[PDB]
Amino acid sequence: RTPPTKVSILDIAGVDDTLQRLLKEVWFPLRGGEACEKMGYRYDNGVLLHGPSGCGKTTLAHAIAGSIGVAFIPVSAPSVIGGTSGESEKNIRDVFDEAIRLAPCLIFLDQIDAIAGRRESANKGMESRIVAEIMNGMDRIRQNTPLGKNVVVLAATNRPEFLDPAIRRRFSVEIDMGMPSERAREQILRSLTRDLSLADDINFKELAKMTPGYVGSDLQYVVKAAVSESFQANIDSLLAQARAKHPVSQPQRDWLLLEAHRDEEVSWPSTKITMEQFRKAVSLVQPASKREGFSTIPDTTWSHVGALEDVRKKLEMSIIGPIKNPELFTRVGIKPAAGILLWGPPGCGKTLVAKAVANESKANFISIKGPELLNKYVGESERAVRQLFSRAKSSAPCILFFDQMDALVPRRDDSLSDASARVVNTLLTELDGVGDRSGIYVIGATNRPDMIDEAIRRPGRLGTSIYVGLPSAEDRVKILKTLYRNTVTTDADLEKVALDLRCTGFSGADLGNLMQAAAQACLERVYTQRQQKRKEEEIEPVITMEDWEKALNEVKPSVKDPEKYMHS
Amino acid sequence: VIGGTSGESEKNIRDVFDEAIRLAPCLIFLDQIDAIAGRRESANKGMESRIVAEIMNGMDRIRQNTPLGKNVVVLAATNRPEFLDPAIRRRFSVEIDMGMPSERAREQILRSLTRDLSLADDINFKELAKMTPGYVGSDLQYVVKAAVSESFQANIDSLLAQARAKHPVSQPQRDWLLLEAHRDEEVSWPSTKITMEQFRKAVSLVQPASKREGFSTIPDTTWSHVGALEDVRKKLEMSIIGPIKNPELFTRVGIKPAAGILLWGPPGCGKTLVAKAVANESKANFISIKGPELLNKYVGESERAVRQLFSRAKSSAPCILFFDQMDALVPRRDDSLSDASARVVNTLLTELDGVGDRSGIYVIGATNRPDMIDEAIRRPGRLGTSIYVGLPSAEDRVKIL
Amino acid sequence: GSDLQYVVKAAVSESFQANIDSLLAQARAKHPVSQPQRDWLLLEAHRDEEVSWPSTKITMEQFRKAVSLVQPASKREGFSTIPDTTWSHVGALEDVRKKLEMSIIGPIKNPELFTRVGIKPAAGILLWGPPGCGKTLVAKAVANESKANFISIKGPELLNKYVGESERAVRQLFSRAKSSAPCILFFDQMDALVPRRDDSLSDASARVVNTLLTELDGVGDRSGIYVIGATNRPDMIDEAIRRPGRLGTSIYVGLPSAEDRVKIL
Amino acid sequence: RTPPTKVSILDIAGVDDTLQRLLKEVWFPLRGGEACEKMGYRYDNGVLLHGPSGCGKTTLAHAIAGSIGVAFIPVSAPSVIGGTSGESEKNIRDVFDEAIRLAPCLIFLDQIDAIAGRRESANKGMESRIVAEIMNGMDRIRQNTPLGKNVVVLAATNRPEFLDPAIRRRFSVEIDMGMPSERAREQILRSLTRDLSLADDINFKELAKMTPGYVGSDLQYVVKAAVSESFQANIDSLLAQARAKHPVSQPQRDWLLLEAHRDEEVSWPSTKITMEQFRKAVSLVQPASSTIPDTTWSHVGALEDVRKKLEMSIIGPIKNPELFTRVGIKPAAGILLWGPPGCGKTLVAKAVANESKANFISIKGPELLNKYVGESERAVRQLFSRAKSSAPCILFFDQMDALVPRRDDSLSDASARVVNTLLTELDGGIYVIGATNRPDMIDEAIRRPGRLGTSIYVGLPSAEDRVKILKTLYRNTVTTDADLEKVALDLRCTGFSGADLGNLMQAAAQACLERVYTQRQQPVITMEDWEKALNEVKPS
Amino acid sequence: VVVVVVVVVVVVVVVVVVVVVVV
Ligand SMILES: Nc1ncnc2c1ncn2[C@@H]1O[C@H](COP(=O)(O)OP(=O)(O)OP(=O)(O)O)[C@@H](O)[C@H]1O
Ligand SMILES: Nc1ncnc2c1ncn2[C@@H]1O[C@H](COP(=O)(O)OP(=O)(O)OP(=O)(O)O)[C@@H](O)[C@H]1O
Ligand SMILES: Nc1ncnc2c1ncn2[C@@H]1O[C@H](COP(=O)(O)OP(=O)(O)OP(=O)(O)O)[C@@H](O)[C@H]1O
Ligand SMILES: Nc1ncnc2c1ncn2[C@@H]1O[C@H](COP(=O)(O)OP(=O)(O)OP(=O)(O)O)[C@@H](O)[C@H]1O
Ligand SMILES: Nc1ncnc2c1ncn2[C@@H]1O[C@H](COP(=O)(O)OP(=O)(O)O)[C@@H](O)[C@H]1O
Ligand SMILES: [Mg+2]
Ligand SMILES: [Mg+2]
Ligand SMILES: [Mg+2]
Ligand SMILES: [Mg+2]
């Protein structure tokens, strides 16, 4: 009945585009209805707020309500149910009547989908009647009003697709708040850190750059996480007092020490948050978008990738580059989104560079292991693909890595069945929806490009093809040095091993097998070495040049026909 | 919190959060939150959907109605975080992953469990931690419970002999009958220290929960059952048996703690026999796959079983996966291979060597047709080494006979 | 009718835009953070201090702005007005223009002139060639020089996750296409909707090939609809399509000249 | 559940054989139960009606119910299923109990196949339990009914094979409502047109001949379409009256004119439906099922020798089935047309199909070959599966030498499996026509008598025949006739077949369009258009 | 009024098949 005059517009930031639409669609036909009365125009606009969960929908609808000043009727869907089938409609009939009786008025149906789901699956009689009562109540607004003191019903929900189409048709105005951009997140961070003590090194613009895919709720956790880091020094001092009072692992003792006193509360000095604590806070906070379905960042760096300079240049100029400098690349017409289909013989490093790109781009990473999205139920197999891109867009920039993609988009022959074709078509449409300025970088890897659909390789789709093939003799030297370096002979002996004619067809995996064979040959030599020198555990196994000599003899290339993989 | 009335169930949850705010500073523990906060998208029921929405409002009332200096923390525990509603999972600012304990953690757990017990001085907890891979904190409790019952084994035989000698059908049925008439006839149990040998016996008796589904029994074959195959035994001992027993030694020279071996050769030469010896002589966990037994008639279930298969081998490392007659599970990817079998080959390609790390899983394959296996599988990283188990020689038949 | 109601609703909001800026200007003059936030704070200040919004009327310039902001419901699913593309946007391809002006453009303009010499309409054209060469561009030029309605619906965009609805969608496609005659249906990347009517098709893709075949028989003579299909692999398309009378005559759109590439670059 | 005395026996026709069985199996154990009572034997008969959809299954069960007069309980299978799993059995248990409580009674389980499906594949618990509930409810009828009165269960379904064999066994009487024949369709048409005013030219036998593959529902639309055409004259007269009363587009005014009067009613003259409107109505109505070709003998030029052979083995034994059957002339299963390609083999088969008024299916060669072991033979069997259902039907196998090659030793196991399937189907009102240009490659078991043992050679025209064909082609599309002689007698048409002459006419037509285009930059088909058409058309 | 727990119908699934080739 009264506005909630405790949250203001200043407390909600980053919604500048959303607040612009809400000015001419909610505020105006609630306070300046006289102009509409002079104009003679009924306002039947049902304003619907939708977007990712945590974007500040509930808070905004309460901040707007407190600012407009007109009578406000907050409605919570679970609180509508009282304990009787007929009483549920009584609560709804007591809202649309009260708003009409107290027009102009604002109705907020928070979590509308909790009582406005799909009626097709609504088997229960009570559930299907609440939707009918709600939808009829909107027509009464258009009828029982002077066409001047309009009543606007505002509904907020994080699942706009769950609304009954009988209801969503009645909500003409739909406001997609979406996720805030880099400029918007800076505004939120400044707004959030307004009652706190801060240092001078805090660059909120820098903080916004390295928090992609965060929403207003997620940015609140980053501030909250940084506050805890600011109090870390005030806990160690509290721990030290407990240690000095008392003459099991260390963390357990800390709980036991603080459990002891529980009454001798000591003053926490009022320190301020530095910039180093904010960087620590961002790492500790996982955004709500990255909670589910996002793979862990691989441990592979460019130091783990030997040679492949041509592939590295293409990857550092099409994916890693645009992620680091989205403005430098967009000046030369390089859009911050790409689709790359890595292909080549097996064992040559297609997955290795994709794991290095995911790790060297510092961006979000989603990995799909072949036909991981297929499900035995109807529609759920296709919904997984659509939901896959529903989070890749929300967490842009994001890297989608389809490993062994020939199993997910096979050639649409007669022997395909009406289950994977429905997924290939869905995957084709989603790749079309990936905008040039969307921020999704799709990487595909397959070792049999002759079995992958040719429709996936068109522009807009995975139209960029990078060939990863067998290394040359000079190329294997970089790879063999890279492999030996990452496991610890020096580097001059590695050139002799890699340039040997017995490694003519070796791929990247074969060179790794060569090193493992030499390592096993060392241990066999060590086992006999420690039996002649002993009959004390001080034996030193070291990979010697003679171990490489017998490793070259017993290792053959895993690739049979190198030219079999150059045909597509 | 579930009530029979049409609104009682939601009211109970509203009462929980309102009470906590009234009782701030308060800690709320929602144990098994996935039971009531499942995805309402798939949980197509109005009460279930309105229960989830009431929790969202409750967790927001705490953030606003609590006065300064009196905070309310909402703890929640669930072993299926993927069942949570994303609108609710986002409402937890902190997610803590308590994975399976490591060797250092298991030693600490055993000390905490064996804290109020009369232990012996020969107990080497750092040895017990290394001999129980894949155990969780709940499994280690059963090892201690099994060890305690073993200590009373000598206290039960004495008690049985007391009843058996007090008055003159198999023997175990007699024991129950004697104790059936021995009710309220309490006899003192002299408590004794739990020997270190009882703990080793207790570990064998306790099977960890990760090994209670899909894990095959260890074969009884040993190296005394295998004749000849001296070269094959050396390669298997260096590639699998070696790193399983001494992981530290092989890590020093730079050998990844994972192996892939493809045993191939003419039929009847001992490919399954030596794979059963490795699975038995390595003293590691064993999962045996009998040909194309992972295939399912539903869409995506065949590849789900393969992915779930490695989800068990990885969590119980070191583990040995034996694919007997492997050519039926990884045929060459041709245009005539159909999609049901081609989607399984690619799933096994990503599991053996992909983005994910499978260190601690050792894969053995046996087949009479090595040339019919996909060329991507037969590369270092998936099945790196091929061992030829051919016909015995003249002097090998003597050892075999 | 629904879209024109949105245009009126859009024009009304634009008509009240001037009454908010004037209200904002008064608040600014009273008081010597992003701009939208200030607007809420400025209007929060007065509130009860009601100022009479002047009663203005909608002009024609506001209606023109409203039309641009409003996307008609027909453009949601590929129905579009006559394209703005002329033959001046199409470089070279003189041979293709002559074939199109005698089999498509001609019969659209004079449906009676062609029927006098026993030339039945709806001859059926399958544009094909490498991607990016102007197959959709030339189809937009045909739609504009024919002065007929143009629909650009792609094979994969019409697919829906249900039994029968993919083939039933095609029949509704020609139902509205018929109501707006003359109309040009452009099936882009048609090789994914009609690959080949073999025995191994299942009664889900067969229901779309059979439905599309019947609709192509019904086309042109009765209604003025000329269906155009595009595919880049003229070996992956169904043989039931490329028969005389439905989709016979094949025109290859590709190989741009040097001057056409200059405009694109 | 009272019997509706609405649809009568007169309103259901063509079921004379069906109505004879239903008299001693439904009427007797519902009205004359006393005779069973004296003998003391309950008569429980579950009558099952099955056939193509639209054959008049639902209507028959309601016409019988209204004539018997006993209590009637209409049951629709989908409405039995309720929201709760247990409620579905509740609906069924409230039916078989009600019939027992209200014996004697008639139960109509319309669309029984919607719930009595095969519980084998119906692995869901509810699906497999409806069938069990249905079967138990029928046993209670046999047990708990009195000796005096019987309860008859009538079930209708268009897919009798989908019924659970545990259920189809409970329906002893099965009536397969096939499709009506020419004699039967005449009875249906007369029954439908019984309360209408008709003219004297209406030949119901002619209507039945030219409506093959129609069912009772389709024939109701044909009657409904002709009735609307019969009122077209009554609307123009109605419009003129409104115009004469009142001195915006025309259709809007017509609505406004009729809104004026309303209560003021003027007489509609009682006109009658002619036969020409019935012929127009049939064309406008497309049956749910192929279609008689539009090619007549006026489209076929010359070929008099071929026509006589075709008019004596196929076309004759269709128009007068009794005149030919009087002298022992069985209708040969078909004709094997052979000759060079493009000479009118498909054209004449379409002409035979049109003067025979039967359905036509054309196969353009090896369309039936499949890479699978069974679908290639199933396509041939499905070809004859529809041909029987739409009898009379003409099956035309064009270029049949690729579908039935000679079964030599070098044949493998793919074409032999197709020849055998085709041989058995030809043994099983279907007129199969085959065409091939290499008769030395077709199996000799096909060309035996009873199978396609009649061979008619359709060959290239010499010179006079092309004149008739070119005149025929030009006549059906609108140069005069003197120029057509010059074109056909030109030495450039030496090897032209029938298709080449058709291609020649299209080339001349295209040459006309080129002339119109240049005329409008600075239409009658002229001789100069033929001049450039002769150059650009090859015999191929 | 007391809301009771009521069981409902089940979802449908997909099944893969194998098809022979005469070639
Ligand atoms: N732009 C923002 N500026 C400041 N705080 C924000 C912003 N967006 C969100 N928040 C904070 O995050 C929380 C948002 O709660 P709210 O219920 O509005 O989330 P939501 O977007 O509506 O999602 P849901 O509907 O799933 O609850 C509040 O604590 C609010 O302070
Ligand atoms: N340039 C390289 N430098 C060092 N090691 C390399 C290089 N290329 C490949 N390797 C080694 O080979 C392994 C191959 O891993 P990856 O999965 O990328 O193989 P692949 O080339 O993708 O073949 P597949 O098709 O079997 O996946 C790497 O993990 C690494 O051990
Ligand atoms: N080297 C050997 N020493 C002793 N016994 C052997 C040896 N090789 C084979 N055998 C005997 O032959 C049996 C064959 O069992 P196994 O399953 O290994 O056959 P296989 O060699 O794997 O052939 P396949 O894989 O074709 O089944 C063994 O169980 C053992 O009894
Ligand atoms: N033998 C017939 N005599 C008269 N009218 C008939 C006959 N057969 C069908 N009809 C007419 O056609 C329609 C048939 O209705 P009905 O519902 O019985 O069809 P059906 O054969 O049961 O097929 P479906 O199962 O699709 O309903 C009615 O309008 C009926 O008047
Ligand atoms: N006697 C004829 N009169 C008119 N047109 C004919 C005649 N013979 C053949 N044609 C024309 O030749 C074309 C091909 O006919 P036909 O030979 O039956 O089919 P196909 O060439 O496929 O075997 C038809 O379009 C028809 O118009
Ligand atoms: Mg919210
Ligand atoms: Mg790889
Ligand atoms: Mg074996
Ligand atoms: Mg019926």
UniProtKB/TrEMBL annotation, chain B:
The lineage of its organism: Eukaryota, Fungi, Dikarya, Ascomycota, Pezizomycotina. Belongs to the AAA ATPase family. Mg(2+) 3 binds at residue 60. ADP 2 binds at residues 227, 270, 272-273. One of its GO terms (cellular component) is nucleus. This is Peroxisomal ATPase PEX1. ATP 1 binds at residues 63, 79, 90-91, 138, 141. ADP 3 binds at residues 227, 268, 270, 272-273. ATP 2 binds at residues 90-91, 141. ATP 4 binds at residues 227, 268-273, 368, 379, 382. GO terms for biological process: peroxisome organization; ribosome biogenesis. Residues 1-102, 257-393 form the AAA+ ATPase domain. Keywords: ATP-binding, Metal-binding, Nucleotide-binding, Peroxisome biogenesis. It catalyses: ATP + H2O = ADP + phosphate + H(+).
